[PDB]
Amino acid sequence: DANFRVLSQQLSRLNKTLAAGRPTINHPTFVGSERCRPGYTFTSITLKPPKIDRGSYYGKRLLLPDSVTEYDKKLVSRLQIRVNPLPKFDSTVWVTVRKVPASSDLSVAAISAMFADGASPVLVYQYAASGVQANNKLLYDLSAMRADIGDMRKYAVLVYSKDDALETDELVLHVDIEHQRIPTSGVLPV
């Protein structure tokens, strides 16, 4: 119905705001995420970091599955990082995702520099005496730069441990790469 569509679109933006950052009955522990860019879908990569020494950091390239990497020219819109903790977890970690050149562009300095430079999004997961931090994730949009499944090898996740020394098993990060849909063929194989 004409123009009311506006008041109602406005009305929604509002609802979503009030809604946002809140867990729901279907996900009573962690905050929710987002609808996908139409035409896009996402491929996830999970990864359990080894121990991360106190004050040190773990890094790791986004290495997608061959099933997908072959369709390398498909566009990546955004990559989301999710920190889910295991029950034994009790530390503080700082996290981001960023294009990281094998130019070998230093280590530790630029790791910690990447947290302050305001270049990429920062998450801060910390053990809550009170519970489990509902806010477990960051959604980084590289849409602007037409990136594709190809360049995902160029990016990496960084995880700086602050006071513990992230022991093996407390945390399992997941990298979900939203990109354009890859077809499902119709042909009996070779």
The residue among 86 and 165 lying less far from a copy of itself, judged by its C-beta, is 86
DSSP string, 39-98: TEEEEEEEE------TT-EEEEE----HHHHTTTTSEEEEEEEEEE--TT---EEEEEEE
Interface positions, 104-133, toward a copy of itself (CB under 8 A): 112-113, 115-118, 121-133
Output the CA torsion sign for 112, 21, 84, 142: negative
The residue among 42 and 59 lying less far from a copy of itself, judged by its C-beta, is 42
Q: How far apart are CA 80 and CA 40, in angstroms?
A: 14
Interface pick for a copy of itself out of 45, 147, 157, 166 (rule CB under 8 A): 147
Question: For residue 16, how far is the Cα from the chain centroid?
Answer: 21
Per-residue string for binding with a copy of itself, 34-63, x by CB under 8 A?
Answer: xxxxx-xxx-x-x-x------x--------
Question: If binding is defined by CB under 8 A, does position 145 make contact with a copy of itself?
Answer: yes
Per-residue string for binding with a copy of itself, 77-96, x by CB under 8 A?
Answer: -x-x-x-xxxx----x-x--
